[PDB]
Amino acid sequence: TCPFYKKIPGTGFTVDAFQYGVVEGCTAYFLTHFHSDHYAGLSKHFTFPVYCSEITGNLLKNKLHVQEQYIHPLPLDTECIVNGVKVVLLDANHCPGAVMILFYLPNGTVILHTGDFRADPSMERSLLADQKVHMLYLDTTYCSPEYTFPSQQEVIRFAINTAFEAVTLNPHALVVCGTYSIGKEKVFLAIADVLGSKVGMSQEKYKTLQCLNIPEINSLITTDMCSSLVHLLPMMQINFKGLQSHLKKCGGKYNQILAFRPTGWTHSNKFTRIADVIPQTKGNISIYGIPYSEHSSYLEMKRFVQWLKPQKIIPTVNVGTWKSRSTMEKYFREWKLEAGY
Ligand code: NI
């Protein structure tokens, strides 16, 4: 059964609700972004209209084999009419093709569904600025003050300098970057760019990246591993065993691995500055965990919500425990009282 925070009242619409079969009364299914917890249940047998961004559409077609006739891509920042209801898709500053959805209900209510997002002050000069929002469906992934992490820019700076330094000292070192979905591409692209290399990867990953409308992508990635000194591997293989094994495969082209595991937050963020991050090392293998987030920090989420001043907030993450729910409602009330809405 579809939970309440996936239904848009006063419409035939659901958001990210493909794992409950045919939802009763649903005339259109919205998909905010191509991450598995959100698309769970789509496949080539799906026969209802799916509304999403162009990039999400490319992935639905090519990776999941959803038939073209059911894929409805919409442009961003544009007022569109879907089954008699005005909607707008906004950039969510999450992974490629991730959107927030604005719904203008026939009765005058305005709903913002953030999908997954990393709130940013630039959102304060989208089409959001123009009108009032009554309900916010909020990505509350890191809705607690302990969740701090740096900007994406500072993390990338750290990784670029780390990689460049290592390979300049040892021209026979290999850089590996872990991945398990789309998003966080800037980590491996930025490192490859500073080293003058393409990024080597499996055919399945290369296929995925070709769906993302990244400019000049054919100049950045390749399936020829041996020509490349930045390799992508599944996140699961980013460990001493997996990387030892991978080093065997390159045929003594390389005598050192420097690997990056982008995580979201880890508790090493309560104590350590990004500048101060050190790897775990075993022999000629080093693994850095770097806190590259595509979700809002606590501070970024609070600022967005205080700016938006919604009338009601419905969290879409961490909703399964009474303790989490209660914690989140407390922070919403503080935020409201502090800003005076
Ligand atoms: Ni996501």
Side-chain angles (χ1 to χ4, degrees), residues 177-193:
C177 281
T179 187
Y180 38 34
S181 54
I182 65 170
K184 311 186 184 199
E185 288 84 8
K186 187 65 167 182
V187 175
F188 56 85
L189 298 174
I191 291 168
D193 172 82

Side-chain angles (χ1 to χ4, degrees), residues 15-23 25-76:
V15 175
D16 296 354
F18 300 89
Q19 69 177 293
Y20 316 96
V22 176
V23 176
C26 185
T27 59
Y29 292 78
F30 284 78
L31 180 62
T32 56
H33 69 288
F34 195 79
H35 276 164
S36 63
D37 283 354
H38 299 259
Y39 65 76
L42 269 160
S43 63
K44 68 154 87 185
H45 308 296
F46 197 76
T47 56
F48 297 98
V50 175
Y51 288 88
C52 60
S53 67
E54 163 170 11
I55 282 154
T56 299
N58 300 343
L59 295 153
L60 292 184
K61 183 195 164 156
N62 294 292
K63 297 291 290 184
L64 291 184
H65 303 299
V66 172
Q67 296 165 49
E68 199 139 278
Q69 69 178 118
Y70 307 107
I71 308 185
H72 299 264
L74 303 172
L76 301 186

Side-chain angles (χ1 to χ4, degrees), residues 215 217-232:
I217 198 62
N218 298 325
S219 75
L220 318 170
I221 61 172
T222 181
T223 50
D224 182 15
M225 303 301 287
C226 285
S227 83
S228 155
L229 61 148
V230 184
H231 296 173
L232 308 191

Side-chain angles (χ1 to χ4, degrees), residues 93-95 117-119 139 141-142 147-153 155 183-184 187 262-265 269 290-298 300:
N93 188 40
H94 185 55
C95 62
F117 88 141
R118 186 167 183 171
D139 165 22
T141 298
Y142 297 125
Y147 298 113
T148 65
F149 34 71
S151 76
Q152 290 175 166
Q153 198 274 339
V155 175
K184 311 186 184 199
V187 175
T263 57
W265 168 94
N269 276 291
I290 64 177
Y292 191 94
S293 184
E294 287 182 344
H295 297 278
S296 319
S297 70
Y298 173 87
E300 293 162 349

Side-chain angles (χ1 to χ4, degrees), residues 127-139:
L127 307 202
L128 287 173
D130 307 47
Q131 93 289 275
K132 170 184 180 57
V133 175
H134 301 83
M135 325 196 86
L136 181 66
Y137 293 72
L138 185 62
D139 165 22

